[PDB]
Structure 1
Amino acid sequence: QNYGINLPITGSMDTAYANSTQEETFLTSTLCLYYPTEAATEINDNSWKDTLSQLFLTKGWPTGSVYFKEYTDIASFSVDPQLYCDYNVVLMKYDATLQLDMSELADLILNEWLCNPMDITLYYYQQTDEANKWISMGSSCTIKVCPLNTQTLGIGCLTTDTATFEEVATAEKLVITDVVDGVNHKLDVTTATCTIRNCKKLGPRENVAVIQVGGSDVLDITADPTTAPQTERMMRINWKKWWQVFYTVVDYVNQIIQAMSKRSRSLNSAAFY
Structure 2
Amino acid sequence: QNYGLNIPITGSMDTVYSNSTREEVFLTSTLCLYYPTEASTQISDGEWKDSLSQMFLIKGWPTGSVYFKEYSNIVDFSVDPQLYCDYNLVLMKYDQSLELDMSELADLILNEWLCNPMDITLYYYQQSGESNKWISMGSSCTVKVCPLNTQTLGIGCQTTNVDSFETVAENEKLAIVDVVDGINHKINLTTTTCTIRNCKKLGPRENVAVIQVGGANILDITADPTTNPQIERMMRVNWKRWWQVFYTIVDYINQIVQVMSKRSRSLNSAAFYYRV
TM-score by length of 1: 0.91
The verdict on how the C-alpha distance between 1:62 and 1:89 changes in structure 2, with shifts beyond 3 A counting, is: same
Distance 2:195 2:172 in 1: 11
Contact 2:113–2:200 (Cα < 8 Å) also in 1: yes
Structure 2 residue aligned with 1:174: 174
Distance 2:54 2:138 in 1: 37
Contact 1:116–1:198 (Cα < 8 Å) also in 2: yes
Contact 1:205–1:263 (Cα < 8 Å) also in 2: no
1:15 aligns with 2:35: no
Structure 1 residue aligned with 2:126: 126
Which stretch shows the higher mean deviation, 192-201 or 10-19?
A: 10-19
Distance 2:125 2:19 in 1: 50
Question: Structure 1 counterpart of 2:227, which letter?
Answer: T
Distance 2:161 2:203 in 1: 39
% identical equivalent positions: 78
Distance 1:263 1:197 in 2: 26
Which residues of 2 match residues 13-162 of structure 1 at below 5 A? 13=13, 14-16=15-17, 28-162=28-162
1:200 aligns with 2:177: no
Contact 2:207–2:265 (Cα < 8 Å) also in 1: no
Instruction: State the shift of 1:179 in Å.
Output: 0.5
Contact 1:205–1:260 (Cα < 8 Å) also in 2: no
Structure 2 residue aligned with 1:270: none
Instruction: State the shift of 1:161 in Å.
Output: 0.9
| Deviation per residue, 1:84-122 (Å, 9 max, x gap) | 111100001111111111111000111111100001100
Instruction: State the shift of 1:225 in Å.
Output: 1.3
Which stretch shows the higher mean deviation, 173-182 or 214-223?
A: 214-223
The verdict on how the C-alpha distance between 1:141 and 1:152 changes in structure 2, with shifts beyond 3 A counting, is: same
Instruction: State the shift of 1:262 in Å.
Output: 2.6
Distance 1:259 1:68 in 2: 20
Question: Structure 2 counterpart of 1:235, which letter?
Answer: M
TM-score by length of 2: 0.90
The verdict on how the C-alpha distance between 1:36 and 1:66 changes in structure 2, with shifts beyond 3 A counting, is: same
**Aligned-CA RMSD value:** 2.1
Question: Structure 2 counterpart of 1:242, which letter?
Answer: W
Instruction: State the shift of 1:136 in Å.
Output: 0.4
Contact 1:148–1:185 (Cα < 8 Å) also in 2: yes
| Structure 2 unaligned residues grouped into runs of 5+ | 268-274
Distance 2:25 2:43 in 1: 29
Distance 1:71 1:219 in 2: 20
Contact 1:26–1:62 (Cα < 8 Å) also in 2: no
Instruction: State the shift of 1:6 in Å.
Output: 3.7
